[PDB]
Scaffold this active site. Structure first.
Site, PDB file in Angstrom:
ATOM      1  N   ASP A   1       0.822  -1.081  -0.211  1.00 24.93           N
ATOM      2  CA  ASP A   1      -0.006  -0.014  -0.148  1.00 24.93           C
ATOM      3  C   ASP A   1       0.856   1.406  -0.008  1.00 24.93           C
ATOM      4  OD1 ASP A   1      -1.947   2.248   0.658  1.00 24.93           O
ATOM      5  OD2 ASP A   1      -3.441   0.479   1.141  1.00 24.93           O
TER       6      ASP A   1
ATOM      7  N   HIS B   1      -0.946   2.685  -4.986  1.00 25.11           N
ATOM      8  CA  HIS B   1      -0.842   4.069  -5.570  1.00 25.11           C
ATOM      9  C   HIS B   1       0.638   4.471  -4.874  1.00 25.11           C
ATOM     10  CE1 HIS B   1      -1.553   4.999  -1.718  1.00 25.11           C
ATOM     11  NE2 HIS B   1      -2.642   4.383  -1.653  1.00 25.11           N
TER      12      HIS B   1
ATOM     13  N   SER C   1      -7.074   4.154  -1.310  1.00 18.54           N
ATOM     14  CA  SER C   1      -6.956   2.574  -1.304  1.00 18.54           C
ATOM     15  C   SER C   1      -8.096   1.912  -1.647  1.00 18.54           C
ATOM     16  CB  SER C   1      -6.382   2.365   0.121  1.00 18.54           C
ATOM     17  OG  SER C   1      -5.000   3.028   0.291  1.00 18.54           O
TER      18      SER C   1
ATOM     19  N   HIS D   1       2.711   8.675   5.019  1.00 16.42           N
ATOM     20  CA  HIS D   1       1.766   9.297   5.440  1.00 16.42           C
ATOM     21  C   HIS D   1       2.193  10.283   6.719  1.00 16.42           C
ATOM     22  CE1 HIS D   1      -1.534   8.854   3.059  1.00 16.42           C
ATOM     23  NE2 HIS D   1      -1.676   7.659   3.474  1.00 16.42           N
TER      24      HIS D   1
ATOM     25  N   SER E   1      -8.102  -1.706   1.723  1.00 15.32           N
ATOM     26  CA  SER E   1      -7.349  -2.722   0.810  1.00 15.32           C
ATOM     27  C   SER E   1      -7.759  -4.052   0.784  1.00 15.32           C
ATOM     28  CB  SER E   1      -5.909  -2.550   0.832  1.00 15.32           C
ATOM     29  OG  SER E   1      -5.396  -1.077   0.864  1.00 15.32           O
TER      30      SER E   1
ATOM     31  N   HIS F   1      -0.754  10.751  -0.885  1.00 18.47           N
ATOM     32  CA  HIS F   1      -0.662   9.853  -2.025  1.00 18.47           C
ATOM     33  C   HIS F   1      -0.103  10.670  -3.133  1.00 18.47           C
ATOM     34  CE1 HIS F   1      -4.123   7.180  -0.137  1.00 18.47           C
ATOM     35  NE2 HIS F   1      -3.325   7.187   0.660  1.00 18.47           N
TER      36      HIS F   1
ATOM     37  N   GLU G   1      -5.712  -8.129  24.586  1.00 20.63           N
ATOM     38  CA  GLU G   1      -4.279  -7.814  24.769  1.00 20.63           C
ATOM     39  C   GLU G   1      -4.103  -6.491  25.669  1.00 20.63           C
ATOM     40  OE1 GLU G   1      -2.674  -7.856  20.951  1.00 20.63           O
ATOM     41  OE2 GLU G   1      -0.830  -7.957  21.581  1.00 20.63           O
TER      42      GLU G   1
HETATM   43  N1  LIG Z   1      -4.666   6.545   3.075  1.00 15.43           N
HETATM   44  C1  LIG Z   1      -4.507   7.154   4.436  1.00 15.43           C
HETATM   45  C2  LIG Z   1      -5.185   8.420   4.501  1.00 15.43           C
HETATM   46  C3  LIG Z   1      -6.431   8.973   3.335  1.00 15.43           C
HETATM   47  C4  LIG Z   1      -7.059  10.189   3.336  1.00 15.43           C
HETATM   48  C5  LIG Z   1      -8.045  10.246   2.275  1.00 15.43           C
HETATM   49  C6  LIG Z   1      -7.896   9.446   1.194  1.00 15.43           C
HETATM   50  C7  LIG Z   1      -7.177   8.527   1.120  1.00 15.43           C
HETATM   51  C8  LIG Z   1      -6.122   8.188   2.054  1.00 15.43           C
HETATM   52  C9  LIG Z   1      -4.977   6.357   5.429  1.00 15.43           C
HETATM   53  O1  LIG Z   1      -6.144   5.971   5.436  1.00 15.43           O
HETATM   54  O2  LIG Z   1      -4.047   6.193   6.447  1.00 15.43           O
HETATM   55 CA   LIG Z   2      -0.995  -8.038  19.190  1.00 15.40          CA
HETATM   56 MG   LIG Z   3      -4.180  -0.618   2.426  1.00 13.82          MG
HETATM   57 ZN   LIG Z   4      -3.322   2.976  -0.243  1.00 13.85          ZN
HETATM   58 ZN   LIG Z   5      -2.863   6.181   2.353  1.00 16.22          ZN
END
Ligand SMILES: N[C@@H](Cc1ccccc1)C(=O)O
Ligand SMILES: [Ca+2]
Ligand SMILES: [Mg+2]
Ligand SMILES: [Zn+2]
Ligand SMILES: [Zn+2]
Ligand SMILES: *[C@@H]1O[C@H](CO)[C@@H](O[C@@H]2O[C@H](CO)[C@@H](O)[C@H](O)[C@H]2NC(C)=O)[C@H](O)[C@H]1NC(C)=O
Ligand SMILES: *[C@@H]1O[C@H](CO)[C@@H](O[C@@H]2O[C@H](CO)[C@@H](O)[C@H](O)[C@H]2NC(C)=O)[C@H](O)[C@H]1NC(C)=O
Ligand SMILES: *[C@@H]1O[C@H](CO)[C@@H](O[C@@H]2O[C@H](CO)[C@@H](O)[C@H](O)[C@H]2NC(C)=O)[C@H](O)[C@H]1NC(C)=O
Ligand SMILES: *[C@@H]1O[C@H](CO)[C@@H](O[C@@H]2O[C@H](CO)[C@@H](O)[C@H](O)[C@H]2NC(C)=O)[C@H](O)[C@H]1NC(C)=O
Ligand SMILES: N[C@@H](Cc1ccccc1)C(=O)O
Ligand SMILES: N[C@@H](Cc1ccccc1)C(=O)O
Ligand SMILES: N[C@@H](Cc1ccccc1)C(=O)O
Ligand SMILES: [Ca+2]
Ligand SMILES: [Mg+2]
Ligand SMILES: [Zn+2]
Ligand SMILES: [Zn+2]
Lengths: 481, 481
Positions: free
Chosen positions: B42, B358, B92, B320, B155, B432, B216
């Site tokens: 990812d 991406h 994603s 990120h 994903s 991204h 946990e």
């Molecule tokens: N992909 C990132 C943040 C994100 C925000 C908006 C659109 C796409 C991705 C995450 O979820 O950790």
């Molecule tokens: Ca764990």
């Molecule tokens: Mg992912």
């Molecule tokens: Zn992604």
């Molecule tokens: Zn992302």
């Protein structure tokens, strides 16, 4: 905007079904390449390709990313590892050694193994590595070098030159000790190392003695001849070859390219690098596509075939200025030249590779809407409450602080051909980047371009396809009719 | 540093000769894939791959860029165009629709055509597009989802879910109107949409009713169950299947994976996303490679074959945070899982694709010396007289001004696992990037992965290779023994 046709899964399923059909139809040739073309997009990394695709798509009144570049249509793709022997992030000289001579070298040298050392003339001899173009010429092919830079610039110089210092354009640049040691300036090597049938690009000034007015800028002394040895290298080149022609403008180039008696053509269109396409004087200067066609007119006459080098040389320059507008418009023109060459040659007998010498720290981000301009603002403000662009650079001369703050940017500003995209780090010039670049291939033996390869593979597959040294025992059938 | 062996042209010529030999030996299969694996990095764009290669190379005490990643050994490479229907720079969820269901979608939706609209539950029905994994299950294959994120993250959710809002992890996230309209939260869809033989990753919290202590972290209430409907989705999933096992830690996972009576395995290892590998508790938590192996142990039992999704899910997260250290170490672990899967499966009957959903605005620049740390400083000061790093981001939370100035950076600082590389533009999260990503392929029909393709091609070539809908008339011979 959301294109309605794309909302239907059938659109995607049909496209993919067609892609599968096309993929299944691909078959390797059992025959050699008669002709070899390498299209080199200087600095044209993967982010450059995508951003250029979008820009080109939109120039054609489409949304952008769905429209293939001419290079996108090439059936075979590989990733190319661009590191120089001594530096992870390479320069144009040592990458040229890799993709033109099939051997990796040290940063800022050209046509030399990595046993040589930058700016040390006395490490040159024994380390010369011969280009595929040189090998093509030995095998009786006609050969051509076409670029929007100085023809003595690092990339084209890779096809003919061997030097520990890419900056040695003319004898004026070569230290006295190196001159005495016989390290020839690149302009000299251009006319002396090998026979080149077609030489097209910039670099007039290095060919003429200091004090020679440039034909195009006779009132700008800075554009004049640079040479200290009193030689007229153009005259020397012409004198060596019957049917040789020198041209410095577009109309004479056109004329020469159609002239059956012209067997050798040298066209030098600016004192230094050619103008960006956006600044080109179309009465005086040929576009890259036009130079490509001119070259093909002459080169194609030889029944044994040709080797042609075509460089989108100022893609790189646009990125260095952190002016993505310039980088991307150069990329489009480069792709147009690829397209034009594909019209003028047959993939039955021509192996064409498109690649980059290396990339740049150019990124395409934010979350812009489909169809929005590549030069536009990312939706939403940054954490400092100011706008930012979808195109950015890691470093380079777009870094600004106004009144101690990052400047805001408007769509009008960001869309200007002079606009410098912001970066994290101020540098006079934005830097190359070291990530893999794409290789696109079509024609005989193009299916050998696959996977992740060293950049040197580019030279080797070309030599192999045309059964040139060291692959004269290629075991391929003669080129297809 | 300059490696001595590389100073000799023969080194490069031999390597290229070997590469040509290998290229020439590649032959397309006439047989179907028994098994399908998609490895999804990812956020793993081309610059991520190269930087990870260098880091991995150096972790193995090599200079870096010359050492292949496991993914680099895959014979077939293509470029994949990642744009979502509505956004040039994708998320994603909608990319998952492309590479898992073979249809492009709108930003932040999952498993839906682009006729659907983000966060509009009432645009869902009729727009569901069925994943290749779902089709594999219908054809009698066992199927597995393995990720370092929440198994309900965008994903993995692409393999089983259909939702207008990737943020709908549990019913707690779903607005009352959407709940009444029957838009199921992703955790529900995980257990309800289809039979999944192996589910491994994070996301415990979404499975249990609010107030359920996490096993946990029983003393951290924030880690507890989120559900408002009083359901125990783990219990519900177990109750539906004889030989089903739920595990929340590594040792039980190991135990379950070796147990012949275990036919269905759900392993949820953190309340939310799994820890970065650098933070993983190796007594409590399996690495991605281990989860991959566990999955393969169970999936491989089915004589009809399997479909497996393996995600390096937190590569993306590192970028990120603009913490390249985290992005790249996740990438290496992801590559290790690819390598491990290649040991446990045969390319004679397994089609394996490695790709990214991406990229990111991550760049690798400056002109660092061969062998220098990817986390180091670029040679030479910037124009503001301060150092800068070879790794930079176009935007993100590494942007800093200390006393109105860009901060200097030391090698010690830049090499820290917590270090945020600088960017041009401050954002809470780096974005991204929209440039093409690589697809690597090996196994039956892998030769169909070529050129520049829409991201949807990934799903389609996989369905085709295993003769799944819509390609049951694939015309391929049965999988090779
Ligand atoms: N992909 C990132 C943040 C994100 C925000 C908006 C659109 C796409 C991705 C995450 O979820 O950790
Ligand atoms: Ca764990
Ligand atoms: Mg992912
Ligand atoms: Zn992604
Ligand atoms: Zn992302
Ligand atoms: C290339 O030329 C340089 C001359 O600069 C040589 O470097 C000299 O080498 C000697 C002996 O090692 C030193 O004592 C001098 O100080 C060096 N000179 C300088 C100014 O650097 C070098 O030996 C030459 N290389 C080859 C291959 O002959
Ligand atoms: C392109 O170059 C040609 C060749 O140098 C130029 O032709 C010359 O022009 C001068 C001035 O008009 C004449 O006096 C010469 O007789 C020309 N020489 C030849 C061989 O024709 C031509 O002018 C150039 N084109 C432009 C637009 O400058
Ligand atoms: C999905 O639901 C929304 C409800 O929000 C619908 O939007 C409404 O549509 C009517 C008529 O067009 C408008 O007058 C309302 O103002 C809208 N409501 C709001 C608050 O946005 C929409 O029509 C629904 N879509 C479908 C496919 O049924
Ligand atoms: C991994 O999970 C298993 C299963 O939940 C844990 O085993 C339980 O541990 C508690 C406390 O020791 C015991 O009272 C239960 O009898 C165990 N249940 C089973 C089925 O064995 C195990 O402790 C976990 N491992 C770790 C390190 O926490
Ligand atoms: N390639 C750039 C600048 C450069 C400097 C140093 C090394 C490589 C490149 C140019 O010549 O325009
Ligand atoms: N393709 C060129 C043809 C040309 C060749 C040589 C010189 C000038 C032009 C054009 O469009 O004009
Ligand atoms: N490959 C794993 C094996 C494993 C499978 C399942 C659970 C834990 C471990 C390892 O190195 O340990
Ligand atoms: Ca001119
Ligand atoms: Mg160049
Ligand atoms: Zn370059
Ligand atoms: Zn450059």
């Amino acid at each position: 905007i959301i294109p309605v046709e794309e909302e239907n899964p059938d659109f995607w399923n049909r496209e993919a079904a067609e892609a599968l059909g096309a993929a299944k139809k691909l078959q390797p040739a059992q025959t050699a390449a008669k002709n070899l073309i390498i299209f080199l997009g200087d600095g044209m990394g993967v982010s450059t390709v995508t951003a250029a695709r979008i820009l080109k798509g939109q120039k054609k009144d489409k949304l952008g990313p769905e429209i293939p570049l001419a290079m996108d249509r090439f059936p075979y793709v590989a990733l190319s590892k661009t590191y120089n022997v001594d530096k992870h992030v390479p320069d144009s000289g040592a990458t040229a050694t890799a993709y033109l001579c099939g051997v990796k070298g040290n940063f800022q040298t050209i046509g030399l193994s990595a046993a040589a050392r930058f700016n040390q003339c006395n490490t040159t001899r024994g380390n010369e590595v011969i280009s595929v173009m040189n090998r093509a010429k030995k095998a009786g092919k006609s050969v051509g070098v076409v670029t929007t830079t100085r023809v003595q610039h690092a990339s084209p110089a890779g096809t003919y030159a061997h030097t520990v210092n890419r900056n040695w354009y003319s004898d004026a640049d070569v230290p006295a000790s190196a001159r005495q040691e016989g390290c020839q300036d690149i302009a000299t090597q251009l006319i002396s190392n090998m026979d080149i049938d077609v030489i097209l690009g910039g670099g007039r000034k290095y060919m003429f003695r200091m004090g020679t007015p440039d034909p195009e800028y006779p009132d700008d002394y800075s554009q004049g001849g640079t040479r200290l040895d009193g030689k007229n290298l153009v005259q020397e080149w012409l004198a060596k070859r019957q049917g040789a022609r020198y041209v410095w403008n577009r109309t004479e180039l056109m004329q020469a390219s159609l002239d059956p008696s012209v067997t050798h053509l040298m066209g030098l269109f600016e004192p230094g690098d050619m103008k960006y396409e956006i600044h080109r004087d179309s009465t005086l200067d040929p576009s890259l596509m036009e130079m490509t066609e001119a070259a093909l007119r002459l080169l194609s006459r030889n029944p044994r075939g040709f080797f042609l080098f075509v460089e989108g040389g100022r893609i790189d320059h646009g990125h260095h200025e952190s002016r993505a507008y310039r980088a991307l418009t150069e990329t489009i023109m480069f792709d147009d030249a690829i397209e034009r060459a594909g019209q003028l040659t047959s993939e039955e007998d021509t192996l064409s590779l498109v690649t980059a010498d290396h990339s740049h720290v150019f990124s395409f981000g934010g979350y812009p809407l489909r169809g929005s301009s590549i030069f536009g603002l990312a939706p939403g403000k940054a954490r400092d409450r100011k706008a930012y662009t979808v195109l950015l650079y890691g470093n380079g001369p777009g870094y600004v602080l106004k009144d101690g703050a990052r400047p805001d940017v408007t769509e009008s500003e960001s869309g200007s051909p002079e606009y410098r995209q912001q970066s994290a780090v101020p540098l006079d010039e934005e830097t190359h980047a070291g990530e893999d670049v794409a290789v696109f291939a079509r024609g005989p033996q193009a299916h050998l371009v696959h996977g992740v390869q060293e950049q040197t593979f580019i030279a080797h597959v070309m030599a192999f396809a045309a059964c040139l040294e060291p692959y004269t025992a290629c075991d391929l059938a003669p080129p297809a009719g």
